[PDB]
Design an enzyme around this catalytic site. Structure first.
Site, short mmCIF file in Angstrom:
data_model
loop_
_atom_site.label_atom_id
_atom_site.label_comp_id
_atom_site.label_asym_id
_atom_site.label_seq_id
_atom_site.Cartn_x
_atom_site.Cartn_y
_atom_site.Cartn_z
CB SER A 32 -0.80 0.12 1.23
OG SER A 32 -1.75 -0.87 1.05
CG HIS A 63 -9.76 0.47 -11.55
ND1 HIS A 63 -10.68 -0.19 -10.76
CD2 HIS A 63 -10.27 0.45 -12.81
CE1 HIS A 63 -11.68 -0.61 -11.50
NE2 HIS A 63 -11.46 -0.24 -12.75
CG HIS A 85 -3.13 -8.20 0.66
ND1 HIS A 85 -3.31 -7.63 -0.57
CD2 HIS A 85 -2.42 -7.32 1.41
CE1 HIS A 85 -2.73 -6.44 -0.58
NE2 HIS A 85 -2.18 -6.23 0.61
CE1 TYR A 87 -4.37 -7.80 3.60
CE2 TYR A 87 -6.45 -7.43 2.57
CZ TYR A 87 -5.14 -7.05 2.80
OH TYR A 87 -4.59 -5.93 2.17
CD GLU A 88 -6.92 -8.31 -1.68
OE1 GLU A 88 -5.79 -8.59 -1.30
OE2 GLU A 88 -7.17 -7.74 -2.79
CB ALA A 115 2.36 -0.44 4.46
CG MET A 218 -1.68 -8.56 7.16
SD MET A 218 -3.26 -7.46 7.17
CE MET A 218 -3.53 -6.76 8.76
CB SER A 219 1.92 -8.46 1.49
OG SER A 219 2.23 -7.29 2.31
CG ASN A 242 0.63 1.44 11.67
OD1 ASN A 242 0.75 1.44 10.43
ND2 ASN A 242 0.16 0.37 12.37
CG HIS A 256 -5.97 2.77 6.46
ND1 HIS A 256 -5.50 1.59 5.90
CD2 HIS A 256 -5.71 3.74 5.54
CE1 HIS A 256 -5.01 1.83 4.70
NE2 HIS A 256 -5.11 3.13 4.46
N1 LIG Z 1 -0.83 -6.35 11.42
C1 LIG Z 1 -0.55 -5.10 11.03
N2 LIG Z 1 -0.31 -5.07 9.71
C2 LIG Z 1 0.00 -3.88 9.21
C3 LIG Z 1 0.06 -2.65 10.09
C4 LIG Z 1 -0.23 -2.79 11.54
O1 LIG Z 1 -0.23 -1.81 12.31
N3 LIG Z 1 -0.53 -4.05 11.92
C5 LIG Z 1 0.40 -1.53 9.21
C6 LIG Z 1 0.57 -2.07 7.90
N4 LIG Z 1 0.33 -3.44 7.93
#
Ligand SMILES: Nc1nc2c(c(=O)[nH]1)CC=N2
Length: 288
Positions: A32, A63, A85, A87-88, A115, A218-219, A242, A256
């Protein structure tokens, strides 16, 4: 594996080979917000995943569902914008289907960006973590991209991963990051992959930190496993976007409004940086 066979990957490669004049040497998967890297391409050809014979299509975002071939800074890239991903909902073997095509495209290196949540306290939102290592929290459970039977044609039934994040490049990267000398340090650490699409509790972050992960996202892991399994050279970054970890005081949650990372500027930085490293990826045909 499952779902696809070799001949699928082949056709997929072929279609793309016979549809773009480009031979990419390098694949780039953007996490992302590192979408923008695709702008830096020169002579971009865009495919919607969409049009590509077996390519998973995106599940919504769409897109930010594109494959652009390009030259980045002295390299024949192919970049995915909007990697898939678990989770998708794809299983690992659609998630990583591209890595398998890039191989057959000729790609010999993959660079993966994501990210990721900072769990090392050393870390500050905006940071870039170069991935030294990962922990495959899904693979330990079964959720590994190479699971079902193994195509000798791409790799060994039991590829090793201790050398996943290629060492040479981890260096050139660390060198390069001082070459232009920036100032917070180029970080380096282990990315733990966690699946689920929701964000971790505090207890969860404890366990993740105490497992010695520095970033969570998660990737990547699946792409990295399948990369390495057909010997691509891999490395990549996380854009720390973060961090949380302490119970006393949720003057906030885990979400987010914290996955911009100052916004463009952090992300932009990672993009330059990636664009720069193009220069360190060993050429293929010969290079010397
Ligand atoms: N699990 C988790 N995955 C993330 C973040 C987070 O704070 N926790 C930010 C980007 N991917």
């Amino acid at each position: 594996e499952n779902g696809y066979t070799y001949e699928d990957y082949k056709n997929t490669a072929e279609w793309l080979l016979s549809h773009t004049k480009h031979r990419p040497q390098v694949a780039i998967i953007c996490g992302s917000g590192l979408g923008g890297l695709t702008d830096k391409l020169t002579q971009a050809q865009i495919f919607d995943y969409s049009e590509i014979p077996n390519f998973p299509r995106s599940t919504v975002p769409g897109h930010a569902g594109r494959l652009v071939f390009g030259f980045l800074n002295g390299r024949a890239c192919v970049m995915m914008q909007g990697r898939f991903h678990m989770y998708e909902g794809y299983p690992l073997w659609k998630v990583t289907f591209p890595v398998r095509v890039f191989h057959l495209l000729g790609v010999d290196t993959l660079v993966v960006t994501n990210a990721a949540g900072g769990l090392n306290p050393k870390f500050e939102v905006g940071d870039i973590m170069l991935i030294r290592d990962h922990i495959n929290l899904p693979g330990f459970s079964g959720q590994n991209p190479l699971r079902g039977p193994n195509d000798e044609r791409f790799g060994d039934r039991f590829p090793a991963m201790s050398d996943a994040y290629d060492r040479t490049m981890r260096q050139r990267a660390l060198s390069t990051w001082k070459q232009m000398g920036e100032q917070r340090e180029l970080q380096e650490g282990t990315y733990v992959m966690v699946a689920g699409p929701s964000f971790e509790t505090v207890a969860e972050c404890r366990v993740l930190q105490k497992l010695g992960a520095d970033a969570v996202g998660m990737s990547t892991v699946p792409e990295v496993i399948v990369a390495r399994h057909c010997g691509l050279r891999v490395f990549g970054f996380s854009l720390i976007t973060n961090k949380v970890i302490m119970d006393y005081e949720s003057l906030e949650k885990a979400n987010h409004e914290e996955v911009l990372a100052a916004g463009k500027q952090a992300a932009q930085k990672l993009e330059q940086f990636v664009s720069i490293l193009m220069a360190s990826i060993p050429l293929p045909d010969k290079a010397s």
